[model samples]
Target: MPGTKRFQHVIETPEPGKWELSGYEAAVPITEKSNPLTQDLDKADAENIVRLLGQCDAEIFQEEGQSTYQRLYSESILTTMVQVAGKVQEVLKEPDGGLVVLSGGGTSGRMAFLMSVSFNQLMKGLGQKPLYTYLIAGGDRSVVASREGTEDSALHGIEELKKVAAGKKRVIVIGISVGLSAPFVAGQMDCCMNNTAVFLPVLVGFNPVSMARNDPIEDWSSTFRQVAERMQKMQEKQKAFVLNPAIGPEGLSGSSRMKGGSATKILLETLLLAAHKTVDQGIAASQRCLLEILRTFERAHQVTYSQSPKIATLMKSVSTSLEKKGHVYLVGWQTLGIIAIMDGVECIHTFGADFRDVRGFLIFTFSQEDFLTSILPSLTEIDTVVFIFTLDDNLTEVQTIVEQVKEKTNHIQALAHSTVGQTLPIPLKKLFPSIISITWPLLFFEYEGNFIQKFQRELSTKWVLNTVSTGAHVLLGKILQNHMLDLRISNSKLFWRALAMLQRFSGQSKARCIESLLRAIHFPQPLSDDIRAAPISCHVQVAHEKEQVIPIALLSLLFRCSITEAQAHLAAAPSVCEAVRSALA
Candidate 1:
């Protein structure tokens, strides 16, 4: 039987790059590496869990380490960002109106959609034509749901890019794959390279080119690394670019939606917003301005995380809601609504959360009457309702909604954003008995102009929502020591993550873990001979319909029991984390 001794031995020394040592997640990129700072996150209380996530996010701005990995704040990264912004400026100046298509898979793709929609809205606010398009691996529906299987299709990626760029004079395609391994993004880059005269490919990721995945993409001649290297070569000639800045690993290992998602938002917002500033104000896109914008975000991080106590308290409340089989709802106005919805959607993939477990409602998307009649009437004490809005948003609507929600339950809170010295209306403030308010300095930089204020508020809201959802799930035991123990196997990347986790905990070989997982996947039903020969993709697809697959597999391995016995053990425990703990004991 696998004992606690083996698990303890492997988890020794919480140090970055310690996984690079032989037999410890060797050869993985920094994006996929387990975070040293959060090795004991499973046992942490709400405050420490929030603190751990903050420290992990802080790695985004950390200067380059003594190691070979380049960081987000490194000179090279800032230079590359300035160059990309320069390219964006040229696209903006094009006579035919070039389109900047932001594309990616899963959370990477969701960020692409967010950036594209938000920036286009900003341009529209300025009375300019929309300059951006967003392409996710599984289309627009994938924006609100997890569609991991679509991430493997290089062909679909190429087809979508072609359709979007039809008749376009000049197009800039930014492909984001946080792990630098999504085939959908690889396919899009290859397609862009094939039409270099019309399309300029820019690869945005967090891994070094050398560490880009070399796995053979289905129906494609070259791998992701091959395409990244090709882009790297084109970058030298000013035809293409690859901007990959290592920001260490996520607090919850391989959950790139955390730091990777945040960094993507930061880098692109800096690049595009700076370009907008350059064009609108006639100021050249310089490194100094870009660094200042980054510093502004760095300050955003500081100010938001400074409210750690309140954040942790809210985290506990959210966790208790989940524990009591209640829901957590985020209702917001404008782009903050989009941020709320994005965070809510991610909980489905991140924690295997039910659609109603945590959800977001946009004021613009749904009418007041619709929300009031459909959602407000169902509110209960167990449900935690959070109102997310900035001072720039409509306080009248916020107050109106809060009063209605208060009638149902007093479990109302506010994630309010305001400029320093601006106070909420006293009556409105009193409605939300608990408010986690973050105040930003007013227009600190003249060059950034008005839009940067909105951008900063959006990012600040994202950090708060990310903390609430991730930390709450951690408290609910969906996570295990910085690992997603209950993640959905909706894609190839997650399938491998689940398998790797099983191998790590069970002290088993990869093949053995795969066998156990396969057996567990088909548990309560016989693993037929024909099904055993099915492709791993098929296995993963089938695994999506199954629950507690990883836990059952791990428990079986650790106890040397059959799948039925493992399921029984899981049924006997209060939670998956407790089940594993009881098994180990």
Candidate 2:
């Protein structure tokens, strides 16, 4: 074979906005690329950190760049949204409608459950039968914790979908995987394709189908991309839909739970809300209506980040408490409470923080007697407590809890929201030394009545809480550059991520990376040939029982030390990033 030198000499350095170009980390999907906006996020102060996050989030609504990638507002995306919304509208009109199952893995799963619960509530409010159900990869409890391992099993996903849609005459399955890398979601999509008579499938993610995960599953014949491609063929007949639009990378690399999660919420909210309006008010789900819904959320992003300075101040306060090894509690009511729980629990798997570092509790489930008798006595002055709520919540209950929390610690703050023309009572507001009040315009309230108000508040609160947890951890040095160097490797996805990180930091071959990772996973014991011969899922199962495998493996490679020596170095360092820094030096 012969070929001409068809192009000029390659540029030695990388350029911005060329993520789609060949040979420029082309294997990494849009959801996993290091965002150009926050490359130095680890070096930023609290205010600058929040500012960077605001800029990164604004990319969600960014118009299509000068590339082949489609963006959130691209015409093709809008047209597809209209098509999906129309299907939902038609399903609602059926006399014997079956069900709408929203399923995903990890943060995607949590978003699925959240949307299902909210929409089902809307149906109940209308005196109609609740038609929406949700399936997280690891069931209901995974909502508050990371169940990374369950996301690896395609068979599990197929079984779950089958059991849920067993008796339904017609079902709509929306399978979400932000990176398009989840075998669980791929299996669900495959199941839907297997039975088009009863199931109308929709795949939601942030990556184009062409960029979906191409890795072969253990027992599955098709990769995620293959299944997505099949769905694309069916999409021509309106039997399936794939809603994926490029939203750039997250502020934190490979942390799809940020921008990816938010974008999922935005797209799902738009589709569901527009369909609800069509069924309720006889207004069709037009592209205009879809754009209006998206723009409403864009406005929410604008209004939320407008208080970035205040949010950053709050982040600093929380970080100070964390630096002192003091506790941080996020207490809220209703859905906001769930949001708090989500932020709190994610810190464990994301930053490897202890459960005591940050915790969330709902007022409905939080006991006053237990707090006064068992909890309040142990709270110190350094421990921080923040109340998350809106004006729509119970003011009397909020003030009561605030008064109780004050008796134990003065390091108290409020992340409160209110609509225009309404204000938090002065007496209650005076209880906290600081309050970050995020006020929304009254127009959203009257726009879609009560529905839009709740949705806007939830999204606003999510942005603030994500900032608090992420910023606090960055200050604590859990990040190296924009990567989670201490990520929990409990699934195949995370295992591959850890291996890629090893390659990146150590400049080692994949074979050497896997060998180092295997040694770390089996630390204190010799790595047998049988262990090396085992499948990755087996490695993941064994890896979850071990701690600090990634950092240990990297230290071994960079320092050219034995596994024992690397463990000793890791023990001497303050954190994983600190260990890596010392080894680099």
Candidate 3:
């Protein structure tokens, strides 16, 4: 241990035979042998064995500076966490034995999995069984190894959930998206609605607001749009509801693994923890736990940032990194690996970025093999690495590789109990638990203010359009508005909507509107008989061949007036009153 660094710190230690009172321990020096070469050799051998066994325990916490930023922002997320917890509990207490199903891909999925598992276990401990199940796109394998294929298939998810949930009563399906998208996950969510399931999407993003417009047809945006649409229809039918809460401008710029992951953990924990306390320990006990979590986040903010100026500096750094499109990685062992993967997966889900873009690789059980096989070959100048470790007396090969990577990167950050070198500076782990705690409430608070409102608007728009028309019509309407414009013109019912609009807008009768529509579209013959034959009832279908008449009628209405004019008058207008207003104006 000669020439090794020693740290002297004081900590509060519990006193023997005293349950209530504890005294502080005086500063005690702890020595760690810092032998970079020796540690590197030892770690190399262990990593070889780990790979052979196909398992490793090293925790990788990447980009330390960003971790500091995440801890700082966590303060704001706490409020949102509290509200979400309360809402989830409210849903659980319904008479129909509430079932919560969580589905997602990658880190978002992982967080869902973690939250579900933790909540269930916690519930069981309190003499209550968990009513939640997880539907990870790739199943259990994806939790450890990357399975990109799982993220692509929305239909597969629908099928999987259908098998597990048959004959269930009053199921609540919770879909998570780090970025408010995920087709495979979305498909299952859609399926949930078809079966009269209640759906909620926990959308996480780096920015306070979602960048994607909540359009039901656009590639990624459609998930939200569809959910919103279904929720609206359910309201009309007097069936179900939806709550979407978006959280955080993640510590690592779109990397939800940092703040987003922690916030997710906090949200689930707060909810289930509260539920357990309420059901088993009584109302006061539940409220006490909730308040405790809230207080934890508040105190965490003070410990992590210490002052507003430092917090400001952290935010500026995050904003600058975001503008440059840089990534923040979480590198560590065991629990930290879980955290790292959580962040990495979230980035992919939210921004549609690659895993390598926001990489999270472990370093504790390091090997030259990993460097030669995984790190060095894949390393790019754009990458920034952060080293996270306890800095104990045991020096290992993983630590050496971290040091080497630190030296190699254009920018290197460190989060450890002590310093390694002059180039490696900044300390974060001193308040790691508090940092995690802080993220929950801060994220919840953000969700309440920004994400919730936007989500409601998106949901309301989807509902209004879909309920007023069938799925195909809803699809067409979305496409037309570049949101959900003109409902699908594939059916006679849609054609009626078109006729209704024309009659209201052109100041013409339904017959005049139909004739003008056919003439305007240059149809070969009059379809007065088909229009008269189509039924006016909801979701009623005319003959398949007659579907073409609907499109013809729509085109006639749309073309007779300019698109701008038509949209200005009819787009997103739900009832005849709005169309009449446009026509009169």
* Top model number, lDDT: 2
Q: How many angstroms is residue 35 displaced in model 1 relative to the true structure, after the best TM-score fit? A: 0.9
**Reference-based TM-score of each model:** 0.92, 0.93, 0.41
Model 1 Cα RMSD, 1 decimal: 4.5
Q: Report, for all candidates in order, the number of backbone clashes.
A: 0, 0, 42
The CA lDDT at 457 in model 1 is 85
Better of 1 and 3 by lDDT: 1
Considering every candidate listed, which one attains the maximal TM-score? 2
Residues 197-231, model 1: lDDT tens digits:
89999999999998888755556889899999999
Whichever of 1 and 2 has more lDDT, that candidate is: 2
> Any idea what lDDT model 2 has?
0.83
TM-score: model 2 vs. ground truth: 0.93
Which stretch of 10 consecutive residues in model 2 shows the poorest summed lDDT? Answer: 1-10
Local lDDT at 4 for model 2: 12
Task: Please give me the total number of clashing residue pairs in predicted model 2.
Answer: 0
Sort the candidates on TM-score, descending order. Answer: 2, 1, 3
Q: What's model 1's lDDT at 189?
A: 94
Task: Report model 1's TM-score to 2 decimal places.
Answer: 0.92
